[PDB]
């Protein structure tokens, strides 16, 4: 669709085409995180530290529970109908809520039914004594418990209990609990005012467990090649289903997606390169990633996605509209494309695509050793293309490259093209540029008003 | 003030009103951080490691002290007057300084008088051997010392001193000091060129103590319910008062605020929702938090503040001005409000406020089960409101909600409104859009200039 060879003369080069793939249909598994460790092995040297700890940690879980009780008890199961089965929500009592938040309210109720099975294991949860342990939910199902600091207690304190004094053992425990709380607050502190939401990435939830999210995922028992990609694309997420202030454990439901490609959609990356105009170097200012869907052109805010070597992985659809004036650049009207003046000493001056070099040879010593003659561009040409029809191997700086053959028009080096208007992109410049335009318009507007009014 | 029910038809919904609350009137407490640990328990296996360490760590404290001496000896106490008591600052010698920095220079001198009491404890400071220890400043007063790594030495190395060789004990110590320095530089390296400034948040200072800022605050002995909120709004801050290159401790003064509400001020959040126009979906582009003070409307850069469920906590006043063309939207001239085209597949299409749904029922299958009939909007309507007077319970997607009654004008579903101009928000689109405007102006300007000149 887009006119590559016209677009190329203004300092752009065709990048690698990437498939567009996104999250879909997540699976669910429930796990319990126990925030307070077990110390019965050496209780005689714990003293009061565990009472102070519980007094503080209770102070940060109670706001979460209070915010979650709203949806958890202002909703009911539908009765009196058989054509539809589902929940019913007391909108009058909920008051103000977003569509996404209301949807999470349904998932929470749907999950609460299963969480109540785990709630019967309360006596075993309190008796754990390893970092990871497996419990029989029923003869038919099992749940995994992850303990915050049981490894440190089992490894450093329990063995040295005879050499270090009882006082210093207690103190060496206090520092660990305090360090852990100092970290935990960044996730479960006041920043978590909407725990009903189901979008918190699992790397955040895992801060309740020393950040060792690798084990927290290994316990799920799923396996796929996409595992490294789903992690980095922030697609794996966990929702807080239940919390119990009498034992300091939270139950989280983990959602595990499977990736899907989107049909007839691809992302075209564009490599920019500086070019000559008059005596000045210029760079065209156009979006670096162009997204095509069903031959419609749109702009993607790619900062939210993972740009792998072959495809772009996004946790959700991130397309955004494009001004029609800009679209005209991509469909071949180079007069529309803005350009910014180059004033730094180092900026890219050549690139390679399909084995053909595009080079701003006015600023780099382009030449080819097959004949030893230099390559030179006159002031009329913005860029030169180099291929094996002119010379088989060429040198740039001191890099030596062997070249392919160009597939487009043979006269590329002799056509030239109509370049567009200059623009400045700095935020403080923009704030000045808007006012400067307004003053210029105002001088013009006063002319029309006077001629219409005074010389009607 | 602002005209909600006109504003609503362009895809906005009234969010939760929040009180506006800020820092005030901090208290001060002084504490010592000792950066080099004590190793006399096992000195024979330290070898040379402590001399190399001191050689490096001195190299990063000396640039801090050099920047602090400037104010510490170019200032004097006022004499020869009794109408005022205070400092006097040698502006000729200070040379170039900001107003905030000069103010912190007064605080430094005011604090230096107390720090010199702590300076008499130098022999005891060097003789600490726990992670926290309490010292008598006088019979009247006490200071706390926090030691960098004393727990690790007391817990891992001192017990194993017999089983591990002396060489590997020295090496296992060297790694720990080097790890600590690798972290410390991110706060006390070159980024801290202005240590006189009194605004460094205490989470940063606590990097001198392994980031266990919870103990560094527990030692203060203050208690308040606000404690989690003052932390997370970054309102608690520490100033470096003194440093001693012969013993490697710094004295920091901690400032502890109490919060205040601001009278007659509140923040109105607005929930956006997409709406139909023509066949296209649109989103109106207006500031999502509107700040009202004494019925002046102004714009807040809320990213500097903490949005709790009931109030916004800011470490200082963050209001900013609003363009009068934008204000005209909020006081009800919907013709002004810009809108951006929707081209992603998923963006919010309904919301709830006061138990009344606002729904873009052209794109979600709105219906109500009390009769089983569908709800439909014609192309003239941007949104529908749904309430229990049209039908008591309604379905969206497959969420089922029970509804309140609307308080405003009864005819909401029949008015329609004058929707405003389209706009595109991407930074590269803006960099195009200014130039396109300029070319359009220039053709117009040339018409006036020629007519005025050639046919004068």
């Amino acid at each position, epitope marked *: 669709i887009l006119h590559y060879e016209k677009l190329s003369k203004i300092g752009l080069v065709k990048g690698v085409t990437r498939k567009y793939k*996104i*999250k*879909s*249909n*997540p*699976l669910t598994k429930d796990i319990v995180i126990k925030m307070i460790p077990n110390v019965s092995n050496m209780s005689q040297c714990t003293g009061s530290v565990m009472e102070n700890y519980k007094t503080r940690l209770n102070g940060i879980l109670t706001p979460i529970k209070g915010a979650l009780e709203i949806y958890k008890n202002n909703t009911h199961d539908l009765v009196g109908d058989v054509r539809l089965a*589902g929940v019913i929500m007391a909108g009058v009592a909920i008051g103000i809520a977003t569509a*996404a938040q209301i*949807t*999470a309210g*349904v*998932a929470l109720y749907e999950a609460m039914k299963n969480a109540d099975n785990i709630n019967k294991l309360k006596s075993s949860i309190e008796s754990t004594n390893e970092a990871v342990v497996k419990l029989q939910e029923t*003869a*038919e*199902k099992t749940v995994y418990v992850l303990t915050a600091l049981q490894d440190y207690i089992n490894t450093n304190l329990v063995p040295t209990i005879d050499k270090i004094s009882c006082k210093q053992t207690e103190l060496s425990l206090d520092l660990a609990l305090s360090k852990y709380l100092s970290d935990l607050l960044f996730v479960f502190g006041p920043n978590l005012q909407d725990p009903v939401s*189901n*979008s918190m990435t699992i790397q955040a939830i895992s801060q309740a467990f020393g950040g060792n999210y690798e084990t927290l995922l290994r316990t799920l*028992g*799923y*396996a*796929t*090649e*996409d595992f490294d990609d789903l992690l980095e694309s922030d697609s794996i*997420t966990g929702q807080i289903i239940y919390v119990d202030l009498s034992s300091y454990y939270i139950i989280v439901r983990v*959602y*595990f*997606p*499977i*990736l*899907t*490609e989107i049909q007839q959609a691809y992302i075209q990356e564009l490599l920019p390169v500086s070019f000559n105009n008059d005596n000045s170097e210029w760079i065209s200012i156009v979006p670096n990633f162009i997204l095509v869907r069903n031959t419609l052109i749109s702009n993607i805010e790619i900062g939210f996605c993972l740009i792998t070597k072959r495809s772009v992985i996004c946790n*959700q*659809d991130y397309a955004t509209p494009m001004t029609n004036n800009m679209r005209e650049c991509l469909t071949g009207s180079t007069e529309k494309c803005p350009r910014e003046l180059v004033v730094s000493s180092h900026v890219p001056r050549f690139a390679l695509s399909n084995g053909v070099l595009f080079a701003n040879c006015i600023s780099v010593t382009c030449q080819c050793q097959t004949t030893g003659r230099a390559i030179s561009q006159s002031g009329e040409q913005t860029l030169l293309m180099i291929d094996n029809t002119t010379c088989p191997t060429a040198v740039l700086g001191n890099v030596i490259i062997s070249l392919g053959k160009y597939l487009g028009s043979v006269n590329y080096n002799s056509e030239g093209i109509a370049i567009g208007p200059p623009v400045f992109t700095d935020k403080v410049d923009i704030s000045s540029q808007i006012s400067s335009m307004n003053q210029s318009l105002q001088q013009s507007k006063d002319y029309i008003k006077e001629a219409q009014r005074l010389l009607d | 003030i602002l005209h909600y029910e006109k504003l609503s038809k362009i895809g906005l919904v009234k969010g939760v009103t929040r009180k506006y609350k800020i820092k005030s009137n901090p208290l001060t407490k002084d504490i010592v951080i000792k950066m080099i640990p004590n190793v006399s328990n096992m000195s024979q296996c330290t070898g040379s490691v402590m001399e190399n360490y001191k050689t490096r760590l001195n190299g990063i404290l000396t640039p801090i002290k050099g920047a602090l001496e400037i104010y510490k000896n170019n200032t004097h106490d006022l004499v020869g007057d009794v109408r005022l008591a205070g400092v006097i600052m040698a502006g000729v010698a200070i040379g170039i300084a900001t107003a905030a920095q000069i103010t912190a220079g007064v605080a430094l001198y005011e604090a230096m008088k107390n720090a010199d009491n702590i300076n008499k404890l130098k022999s005891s400071i060097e003789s600490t051997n726990e992670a926290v220890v309490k010292l008598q400043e006088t019979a009247e007063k006490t200071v706390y010392v926090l030691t960098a790594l004393q727990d690790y030495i007391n817990t891992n190395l001192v017990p194993t001193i017999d089983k591990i060789s002396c060489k590997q004990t020295e090496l296992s110590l060297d790694l720990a000091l080097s790890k600590y320095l690798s972290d410390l530089l991110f706060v006390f390296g070159p980024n801290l060129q202005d240590p006189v400034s009194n605004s460094m948040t205490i989470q940063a200072i606590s990097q001198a103590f392994g980031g266990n800022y919870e103990t560094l605050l527990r030692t203060l002995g203050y208690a308040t319910e606000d404690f989690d909120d003052l932390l997370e709004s970054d309102s608690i801050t520490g100033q470096i008062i003194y440093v001693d290159l012969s013993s490697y401790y710094i004295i920091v003064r901690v400032y502890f605020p109490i919060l205040t509400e601001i009278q007659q001020a509140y923040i109105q959040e607005l929930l956006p929702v997409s709406f139909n126009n023509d066949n296209s979906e649109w989103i109106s582009i207006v500031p999502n938090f509107i700040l009202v003070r004494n019925t002046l409307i102004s714009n807040i850069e809320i990213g500097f503040c903490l949005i709790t469920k009931r109030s916004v906590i800011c470490n200082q006043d963050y209001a900013t001005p609003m363009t009068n063309n934008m204000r005209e939207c909020l006081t009800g001239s919907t013709e002004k409000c810009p809108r951006e085209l929707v081209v992603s*597949s*998923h963006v919010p299409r309904f919301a709830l406020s006061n138990g009344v749904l606002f729904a873009n029922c052209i794109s979600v299958t709105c219906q109500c089960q009390t009769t089983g009939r569908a709800i439909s909007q014609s192309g003239e309507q941007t949104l529908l409101m749904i309430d229990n007077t049209t039908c008591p319970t309604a379905v969206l*997607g*497959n*969420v089922i909600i029970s509804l309140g009654k609307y308080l405003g004008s009864v005819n909401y579903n029949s008015e329609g409104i004058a929707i405003g101009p389209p706009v595109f928000t991407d930074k590269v689109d803006i960099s195009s859009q200014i130039s396109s405007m300029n070319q359009s102006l220039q053709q117009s300007k040339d018409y006036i200039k020629e007519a005025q000149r050639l046919l004068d």
Partner: nanobody, 124 residues
Framework: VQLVESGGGLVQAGGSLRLSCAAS????????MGWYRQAPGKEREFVAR????????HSADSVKGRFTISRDNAKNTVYLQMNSLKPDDTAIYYC??????????????????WGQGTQVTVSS
């Protein structure tokens, strides 16, 4: 929408099978397919899952390398190839199909379809 499983039966331990699920209607080109099995005296456990294009698969770690899954959009079928079956693998196998959804992580009442199930057993 109707699904039907086929090819079950009895095999010697260490044997192999090709369980085949077949679909109906034109809509087959967009459904996430998968398999669940119900061992006697156990909850229905997940086995494998496959995207619409067949380029992406996901499965339980307990069957990693042991089992492989593939789909054919021309025949409108899903194939599960099992190797070196152990005695514990005996269970009823159910074919599963689920319409593709994105955006929200949860979708209330998302319509799911299940096959009729088929028997698989292993002899020591």
């Amino acid at each position: 929408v109707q699904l039907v499983e086929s090819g079950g039966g009895l095999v010697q331990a260490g044997g192999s099978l090709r369980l085949s699920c077949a679909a109906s209607g034109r809509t087959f080109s967009s459904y996430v397919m998968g398999w669940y099995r119900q061992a006697p005296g156990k909850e229905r456990e997940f086995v494998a899952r496959i995207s619409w294009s067949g380029g992406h698969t996901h499965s339980a770690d307990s069957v990693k390398g042991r089992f492989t899954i593939s789909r054919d959009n021309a025949k409108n079928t899903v194939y599960l190839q099992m190797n070196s079956l152990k005695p514990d693998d005996t269970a009823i196998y159910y074919c599963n199909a689920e319409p593709t959804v994105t955006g929200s992580w949860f979708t209330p009442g998302l319509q799911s379809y299940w096959g009729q199930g088929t028997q698989v057993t292993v002899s020591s």
